[PDB]
Amino acid sequence: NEWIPTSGPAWKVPYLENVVKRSGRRLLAELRIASNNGSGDRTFLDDV
Amino acid sequence: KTLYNYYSEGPSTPIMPHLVNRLRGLDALAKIDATLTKVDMNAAYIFALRPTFPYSYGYKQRFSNRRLTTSAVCYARTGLSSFLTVNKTYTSNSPLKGGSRGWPIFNVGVSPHVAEPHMRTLSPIGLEVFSQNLATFSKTLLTASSKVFTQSLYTADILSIFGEVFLPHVMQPVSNYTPILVRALLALIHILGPGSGNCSLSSSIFESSIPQFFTVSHSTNMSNRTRYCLHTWSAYKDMFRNGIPPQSTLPGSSARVLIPAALVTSPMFPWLLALVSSGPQFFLYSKDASINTVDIGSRGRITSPIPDVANLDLHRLWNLFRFDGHRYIDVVIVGVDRDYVWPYQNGVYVHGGKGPNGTDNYGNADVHDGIGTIFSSFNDNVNVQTSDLILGLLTLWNHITTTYATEEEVTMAIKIAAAFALVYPVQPIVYSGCPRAFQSHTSYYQPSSENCYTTDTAEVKSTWDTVELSVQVNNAMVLGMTLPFGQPTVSSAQWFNNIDKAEISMFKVGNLPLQNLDYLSLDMMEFYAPTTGQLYDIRSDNLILSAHRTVNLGIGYTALADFFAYLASVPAQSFYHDRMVTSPISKQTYSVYERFIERFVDDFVGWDRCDLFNLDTLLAAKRIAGVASSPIPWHCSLQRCPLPIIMHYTGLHFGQEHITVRDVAGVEGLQQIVMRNDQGKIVVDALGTAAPSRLAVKLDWSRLSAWYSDTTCAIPLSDRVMEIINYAAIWDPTQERRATGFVYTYFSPNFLSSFNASEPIFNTSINLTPPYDDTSHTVIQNLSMPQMLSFDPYYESTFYVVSADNEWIPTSGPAWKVPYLENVVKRSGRRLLAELRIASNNGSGDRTFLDDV
């Protein structure tokens, strides 16, 4: 009864959140396949 | 209004009306829900006599990456709940840890002023007598009307015997009952004990809870006893010619009370003979002090019973007071036979009742010395449960308030009893010393302390506690204890080596009005019509609620007294044992403290000031013989309550918003302090800031708060070096050596560890150590009033807060640990539990069904 439940926790309370954060290797792959994609089948065979 | 409204408002320029209205409003907020008294007696006691006063506090530094306390919550309490002395059988001369060698006796006399009686309406018998003696007769010796001539004018042949006796009061029906209500309140509060739970000179000894068992004790030399004579109505009539005098004679017989035989058996009767007599006719102790006393450490550890508790006595505050009432009382008892047996003590024979050897119509009116001879419940060695010793007081208060008294009398009794409600120890004060750079400009260079006394050895003692409780130190500390208004004592008692002796001085600490027993007899014989329905306050009929009101009023009285002492610039050393030998400035400060107290009492209490506060005990100091005053300047005001309670009652604000950061660019707000020597060389030339004057504080009350932010440092625990001394000092032009330090009042680390509990209960399972913080392990707290704005009571001069090396600029703000306080609204867990039990889940049946009224 020293601690009142309405007053909130007196211990270590964790808190979580979902975050949008890509990895370094994912960004590296994105750079390799989109930014610096030369190919030739996408530069020339794009009229479809 | 609520506490949220009062905590959001501060003092105003007309300050006496503000303080008085604030105190009245706070009195209006003292509710304890009397239904609780019928379910939880102990919780009601704790809530009524030991108020909590929650507050929040923190520290703030400027250039530190260390993490200190920011918003901690504590609960501040004031006053001594009981007293610890050596037991009567202690023979040795060695000092005991926390056990005093004698307690003070706050002796109260008889007030020359008589409480003004208000009108009363006569009962049908009283109205019969009134319309009888007012009727026109024709004397004529044929009839009995002529018996006032042929026989003495005190004849009962025209009126009745009772009508003849009560003729003057039948002619003028008046009554007043505050003198007995004051004593009832004082008796309850002193028996149970209000305050913080501290019960000794040391600030580490505490009471585990409100006691549950008392022990009576008799002392011929120390008790203030009165003489009782017991008769019967028929036997009392036969003493005189044929009827008893309307006015009682001189010799006992100084007072007379008429009790119907149906009211003698009530539990209120022994407490009715008391509370009008002179006390204390008997002394009360805690039954076994080894189970109601604990020791609190610096960090908060509550240890096993007191190291030398086997040689200690736990006096109640009942033993610390002395009242002057009636010295001779005639108990009459009307409506009883000649075989009446006294139902309260074996071997006591009522005059006109049963005799010793089965005889009838006992012929001797024996005089009994002290209420302990009769009323075997008050015998020499009697163990008494708390409930059955307080039940009589409760019944007496309820009956008198709901039958014979009015609301005004109850309020007056509460306010008067609030003045004698609490007892405080000597004020402990520290002294930071002075910066080294001013070593040649000081008379008080070394840091020091005064009246700092703790006895716990489980943890590390603070460096400021250096008091060794010797005999002379014990006497000096005993003669420093004060009432809420600041009145000390010069009387004392000592029960040591099986020898008991009391030294009572002619100078009393106060006076209480005497209770007229004629009104008592008239009401209890139903000559006056009862005053039923003249109690519009719901708390005025219980006693416990009323006692809570007077305890709160007394704490308000002491808070306002400390605030007035700061306002009137009254040093804390004017209330020690050497207040009269040190320097006449004590009386010069009294000459303003008296004006402040007189205005407050004339504006709030409504009673005569000379009954509640004089200078008599202050001006009769004894100084002892071999106790030397510590080298401390008289810069600290009189203070017995910590800062949070003071700002609760007065409305002061000391938050963190008054601490400045202020990267300094210009010269605004700064002064240059120069001291040139004989040949013209400049030796000081320091930066300083001007301390505010009381006039500026009157026109701007925030200036005081900022003042508190400019000269306050957190007191260290293990070292005698305060960081404020590393940066700043006080420059006083009116001192021969102008440089000086800071004083502050210091309570104890243990007394503040006791503030970590929401309620004053500490046995073993309470955790007074604050977890996850650890800051209190090095810095204690600063709950003191700020430095006194004037060191002269009559003439105003400006002193300065000066820098020590000019590296720190005073305008830039403090560079030390600055504390900040705030009053917070935070109920306790047990208080909420009681509120749930008495309001949310109250079934009863008398409130579900008997609600139509």
* Residue of B332, B361, B787, B692 lying closest to B518 (CA atoms): B332
Mutating which of A1, A3, A13 best tests the B interface, going by the most B Cβ atoms within 10 A? A1
Mutating which of B47, B71, B758 best tests the A interface, going by the most A Cβ atoms within 10 A? B758
- Cα(B770)–Cα(B772) distance, rounded to whole angstroms? 7
* Residue of B838, B758, B837, B842 lying closest to B46 (CA atoms): B758
Can you name the residues that pair with B412 across neighbouring β-strands? Answer: none
Distance from CA of A5 to the nearest CA of B (A): 9
Partner-chain contact B830 A4, CB within 8 Å: no
Q: Compute the radius of gyration of chain B from its Cα atoms.
A: 30
User: Nearest chain B Cα to A6, which residue?
Assistant: B829
Nearest to A3 among B766, B829, B833 (CB): B829
Expressed in percent and rounded to 5, the helix, strand and coil fractions of chain B are 30, 15, 55
Partner-chain contact A4 B767, CB within 8 Å: no
Instruction: Kindly tell me the sign of the dihedral angle through the C-alpha atoms of B578, B583, B585, B590.
Output: positive
Are B559 and B646 within 8 A, CB to CB? yes
- Cα(B595)–Cα(B598) distance, rounded to whole angstroms? 5
With beta carbons under 8 A apart, name residues in chain B contacting A1. Answer: 829-830, 833
User: Nearest chain B Cα to A11, which residue?
Assistant: B772
Chain A residues touching chain B at CB-CB below 8 Å: 1-4
Give strand ranges (E) for B746-827: 800-803, 818-823
State the greatest distance between any 2 C-alpha atoms of chain B, in Å, as a whole number.
114
Distance from CA of B766 to the nearest CA of A (A): 9
With beta carbons under 8 A apart, name residues in chain A contacting B302. Answer: none
With beta carbons under 8 A apart, name residues in chain A contacting B52. Answer: none
User: Nearest chain B Cα to A12, which residue?
Assistant: B772
Amino acid identity at B766: I
Mutating which of A4, A11, A12, A13 best tests the B interface, going by the most B Cβ atoms within 10 A? A4
How were these coordinates obtained?
A: cryo-EM
Output the CA–CA distances (angstroms, integers) from residue B60 to B417, B657, B779, B786, in the order listed: 42, 11, 12, 17
Are B484 and B186 within 8 A, CB to CB? no
Cβ neighbours of A46 (radius 10 Å): 7
SS3 per-residue string spanning B592-659: HHHHHHHHHHHHCCCCCHHHHCCCCCHHHCCCCCCCCCCCCCCCCECCCCCHHHHHHHHCCCCCHHHC
With beta carbons under 8 A apart, name residues in chain A contacting B766. Answer: 2
Task: Reduce the DSSP state of residue B768 to 3 states and report it.
Answer: coil
What phi, psi does B376 have (nearest 5°)? -50, -15
Task: Pull the structure tokens for residue B246.
Answer: 């309307």
Chain B residues touching chain A at CB-CB below 8 Å: 757-758, 766-767, 829-830, 832-833
What phi, psi does B449 have (nearest 5°)? -160, 160
Distance from CA of A12 to the nearest CA of B (A): 10
Distance from CA of A7 to the nearest CA of B (A): 10
Q: Which residues contact B511 (CB under 8 A, 6 or more apart)?
A: B108, B109, B110, B111, B112, B610, B611
- Cα(B337)–Cα(B752) distance, rounded to whole angstroms? 62
Pairing status of strand B499-503 against strand B492-496: antiparallel
- Cα(B308)–Cα(B84) distance, rounded to whole angstroms? 11
Are B785 and B637 within 8 A, CB to CB? yes
Overall resolution, Å: 2.6
State the angle between helix axes of B15-27 and B544-567 in degrees (0 to 180), rounded to the nearest 10.
160
Q: Which residues contact B752 (CB under 8 A, 6 or more apart)?
A: B74, B776, B780, B781, B783
State the angle between helix axes of B15-27 and B643-650 in degrees (0 to 180), rounded to the nearest 10.
100
Task: Pull the structure tokens for residue B330.
Answer: 């005639």
Partner-chain contact A2 B832, CB within 8 Å: no
Cβ neighbours of B409 (radius 10 Å): 26
Sheet containing strand B227-230, strands side by side: B255-257, B328-331, B227-230, B367-369
For chains A and B, what is the number of CB pairs under 8 angstroms?
A: 11
- Cα(B284)–Cα(B317) distance, rounded to whole angstroms? 9
- Cα(B220)–Cα(B218) distance, rounded to whole angstroms? 7
User: Nearest chain B Cα to A1, which residue?
Assistant: B829
User: Nearest chain A Cα to B830, which residue?
Assistant: A1
DSSP labels for A13-48? Answer: -----------HHHHHHHIIIIIT---STTTTTT--
- Cα(B87)–Cα(B585) distance, rounded to whole angstroms? 39
Partner-chain contact A1 B830, CB within 8 Å: yes
Distance from CA of B467 to the nearest CA of A (A): 35
Distance from CA of A10 to the nearest CA of B (A): 10
User: Nearest chain A Cα to B827, which residue?
Assistant: A4
Output the CA–CA distances (angstroms, integers) from residue B445 to B436, B710, B736, B738, in the order listed: 8, 21, 14, 12
* Residue of B641, B728, B736 lying closest to B689 (CA atoms): B728
**DSSP symbol at B38:** G
* Residue of B207, B214, B382 lying closest to B309 (CA atoms): B207
**DSSP symbol at B117:** P
What phi, psi does B332 have (nearest 5°)? -100, -50
- Count of residues making up chain B: 853
SS3 per-residue string spanning B219-273: CCCCCCCCEEEEECHHHHHHHCCCCCCCCCCCCCCCEEECCEHHHHCCCHHHHHH
* Residue of B737, B743, B719 lying closest to B432 (CA atoms): B743
Task: Pull the structure tokens for residue B218.
Answer: 């008799």
With beta carbons under 8 A apart, name residues in chain A contacting B757. Answer: 2
- Cα(B238)–Cα(B235) distance, rounded to whole angstroms? 5
H or E element at residue B493:
strand B492-496
With beta carbons under 8 A apart, name residues in chain B contacting A2. Answer: 757-758, 766-767, 829
User: Nearest chain A Cα to B761, which residue?
Assistant: A2
Distance from CA of A3 to the nearest CA of B (A): 7
Are B112 and B175 within 8 A, CB to CB? no
With beta carbons under 8 A apart, name residues in chain A contacting B75. Answer: none
**Residue tagged 């949070």 (tokens):** B644
Q: Is B195 left (phi over 0), alpha (psi -120 to 50) or beta?
A: left
Distance from CA of B444 to the nearest CA of A (A): 45
Partner-chain contact A2 B833, CB within 8 Å: no
User: Nearest chain A Cα to B831, which residue?
Assistant: A1
Output the CA–CA distances (angstroms, integers) from residue B503 to B111, B278, B461, B792, in the order listed: 21, 17, 35, 35
Are B493 and B503 within 8 A, CB to CB? yes
Cβ neighbours of B264 (radius 10 Å): 19
- Cα(B743)–Cα(B693) distance, rounded to whole angstroms? 19
User: Nearest chain A Cα to B759, which residue?
Assistant: A2
The half-sphere exposure of B722 on its side-chain side, counting CA atoms within 13 A, is 29
- Cα(B827)–Cα(B837) distance, rounded to whole angstroms? 15
User: Nearest chain B Cα to A5, which residue?
Assistant: B829
With beta carbons under 8 A apart, name residues in chain B contacting A3. Answer: 829
Are B321 and B223 within 8 A, CB to CB? no
What phi, psi does B164 have (nearest 5°)? -65, -40
Q: Which residues contact B415 (CB under 8 A, 6 or more apart)?
A: B550, B553, B604, B605, B606, B607
Output the CA–CA distances (angstroms, integers) from residue B663 to B132, B305, B756, in the order listed: 91, 54, 37
Partner-chain contact A2 B758, CB within 8 Å: yes
User: Nearest chain A Cα to B765, which residue?
Assistant: A2
With beta carbons under 8 A apart, name residues in chain B contacting A11. Answer: none
Output the CA–CA distances (angstroms, integers) from residue B828 to B500, B582, B770, in the order listed: 43, 45, 17
Distance from CA of A17 to the nearest CA of B (A): 25
**Residue tagged 């020690």 (tokens):** B576
* Residue of B527, B490, B307, B438 lying closest to B739 (CA atoms): B438
With beta carbons under 8 A apart, name residues in chain A contacting B767. Answer: 2
Output the CA–CA distances (angstroms, integers) from residue B782 to B59, B429, B576, B703, B816, in the order listed: 10, 11, 22, 19, 13
Distance from CA of B832 to the nearest CA of A (A): 9
Partner-chain contact B758 A3, CB within 8 Å: no
DSSP labels for B393-460? Answer: HHHHHHHIIIII--HHHHHHHHHHHGGGS--B-PPPEEE----GGGGGG-S--S-EEES------SSP
**DSSP symbol at B714:** P
- Cα(B21)–Cα(B600) distance, rounded to whole angstroms? 11
- Cα(B193)–Cα(B199) distance, rounded to whole angstroms? 10
Distance from CA of B659 to the nearest CA of A (A): 29
With beta carbons under 8 A apart, name residues in chain B contacting A8. Answer: none
Distance from CA of A18 to the nearest CA of B (A): 29
Are B583 and B573 within 8 A, CB to CB? no
With beta carbons under 8 A apart, name residues in chain B contacting A4. Answer: 829, 832
